[PDB]
């Protein structure tokens, strides 16, 4: 599987649940994760994916424009360290990365 492009949405197929992250380059993604509440983390895709299959899935590019990729990366990185109080359902994780790629829904 070739290297994702900065700003790409990454859909990760964990057993019985999906997780979402956004590629920020040089092997890193930004995503919501538990400390062990949830926190925005910058981590290696290698570690976040682990042994689980994943794909790039920019599902809304058909009908919506992605933001300039420099802006996507900047916004994602600025949020690293921020905490949120909602559960890490696929839906919430997807919503988070959608906002980064496409802007506020």
UniProtKB/Swiss-Prot annotation:
Q: Name one GO cellular component term.
A: perinuclear region of cytoplasm
**Keyword Flavoprotein: yes or no?**
no
Query: Is Hydrolase among the key words of this record?
Result: yes
Induction info: By IFNG and IRF1.
Q: Which residues lie on this side of the membrane: Cytoplasmic?
A: 1-105
Topology in the lipid bilayer is annotated as: Single-pass membrane protein
The reactions it catalyses are:
a 1,2-diacyl-sn-glycero-3-phosphocholine + H2O = a 1-acyl-sn-glycero-3-phosphocholine + a fatty acid + H(+); a 1,2-diacyl-sn-glycero-3-phosphocholine + H2O = a 2-acyl-sn-glycero-3-phosphocholine + a fatty acid + H(+); 1,2-dihexadecanoyl-sn-glycero-3-phosphocholine + H2O = 1-hexadecanoyl-sn-glycero-3-phosphocholine + hexadecanoate + H(+); 1,2-dihexadecanoyl-sn-glycero-3-phosphocholine + H2O = 2-hexadecanoyl-sn-glycero-3-phosphocholine + hexadecanoate + H(+)
Tissue expression, as annotated, is:
Widely expressed. Low expression, if any, in hematopoietic cells and thymus. In testis, confined to round spermatids. Expressed in normal ovarian epithelial cells. Down-regulated in some ovarian carcinomas and testicular germ cell tumors. Highly expressed in white adipose tissue.
Influence of pH: Optimum pH is 9.
Task: Enumerate the subcellular locations listed in this protein's record, separating them with semicolons.
Answer: Cell membrane; Cytoplasm; Cytoplasm, Cytosol; Cytoplasm, Perinuclear region
The alphabetized list of GO BP terms reads: ether lipid metabolic process; lens fiber cell differentiation; lipid catabolic process; membrane disassembly; N-acylphosphatidylethanolamine metabolic process; organelle disassembly; peroxisome organization; phosphatidylethanolamine acyl-chain remodeling
Q: What are the entry keywords?
A: Cell membrane, Cytoplasm, Disease variant, Endoplasmic reticulum, Host-virus interaction, Hydrolase, Lipid degradation, Lipid metabolism, Lysosome, Membrane, Mitochondrion, Nucleus, Peroxisome, Transferase, Transmembrane, Transmembrane helix
Q: Which GO terms describe its molecular function?
A: acyltransferase activity; lipid binding; N-acyltransferase activity; phospholipase A1 activity; phospholipase A2 activity
Q: Which residues form the active site?
A: 19, 31, 93
- Grouped into one coarse class, the protein's main location is membrane
Domain (LRAT): residue spans on this chain = 9-105
Name the EC number(s): 2.3.1.-, 3.1.1.32, 3.1.1.4
Q: Which disease is it linked to?
A: Lipodystrophy, familial partial, 9: An autosomal recessive form of partial lipodystrophy, a disorder characterized by abnormal subcutaneous fat distribution. FPLD9 patients are lean and show muscular hypertrophy, insulin-resistant diabetes with hyperinsulinemia, hypertriglyceridemia with low high-density lipoprotein (HDL) cholesterol, liver steatosis, and polycystic ovary syndrome with hirsutism. Some patients have more generalized lipoatrophy, whereas others have abnormal fat accumulation in the face and neck regions and show cushingoid or acromegalic facial features.
What is written about domains in the entry's comments? Answer: The C-terminal transmembrane domain is required for the targeting of the protein to damaged organelles.
* Quaternary assembly: Interacts with PPP2R1A; this interaction might decrease PP2A activity.
Q: State the protein's purpose.
A: Exhibits both phospholipase A1/2 and acyltransferase activities. Shows phospholipase A1 (PLA1) and A2 (PLA2) activity, catalyzing the calcium-independent release of fatty acids from the sn-1 or sn-2 position of glycerophospholipids. For most substrates, PLA1 activity is much higher than PLA2 activity. Shows O-acyltransferase activity,catalyzing the transfer of a fatty acyl group from glycerophospholipid to the hydroxyl group of lysophospholipid. (Microbial infection) Acts as a host factor for picornaviruses: required during early infection to promote viral genome release into the cytoplasm. May act as a cellular sensor of membrane damage at sites of virus entry, which relocalizes to sites of membrane rupture upon virus unfection. Facilitates safe passage of the RNA away from LGALS8, enabling viral genome translation by host ribosome. May also be involved in initiating pore formation, increasing pore size or in maintaining pores for genome delivery. The lipid-modifying enzyme activity is required for this process.
Q: Which family does it belong to?
A: Belongs to the H-rev107 family.
Under what name is this protein listed? Phospholipase A and acyltransferase 3
> Which species?
Homo sapiens
């Amino acid at each position: 599987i070739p290297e994702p492009k900065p700003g790409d949405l990454i859909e990760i197929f964990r057993p019985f649940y999906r997780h979402w992250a956004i590629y920020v380059g040089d092997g890193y993604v930004v995503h919501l994760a538990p400390p062990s509440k949830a926190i925005v983390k910058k981590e290696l895709l290698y570690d976040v994916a682990g042994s689980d299959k994943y794909q790039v899935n920019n599902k809304h590019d058909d009908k919506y424009s992605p933001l300039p990729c420099s802006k996507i990366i900047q916004r994602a990185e600025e949020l690293v360290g921020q905490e949120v109080l909602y559960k890490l359902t696929s839906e919430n994780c997807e919503h988070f990365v959608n906002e980064l790629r496409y802007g506020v829904a």
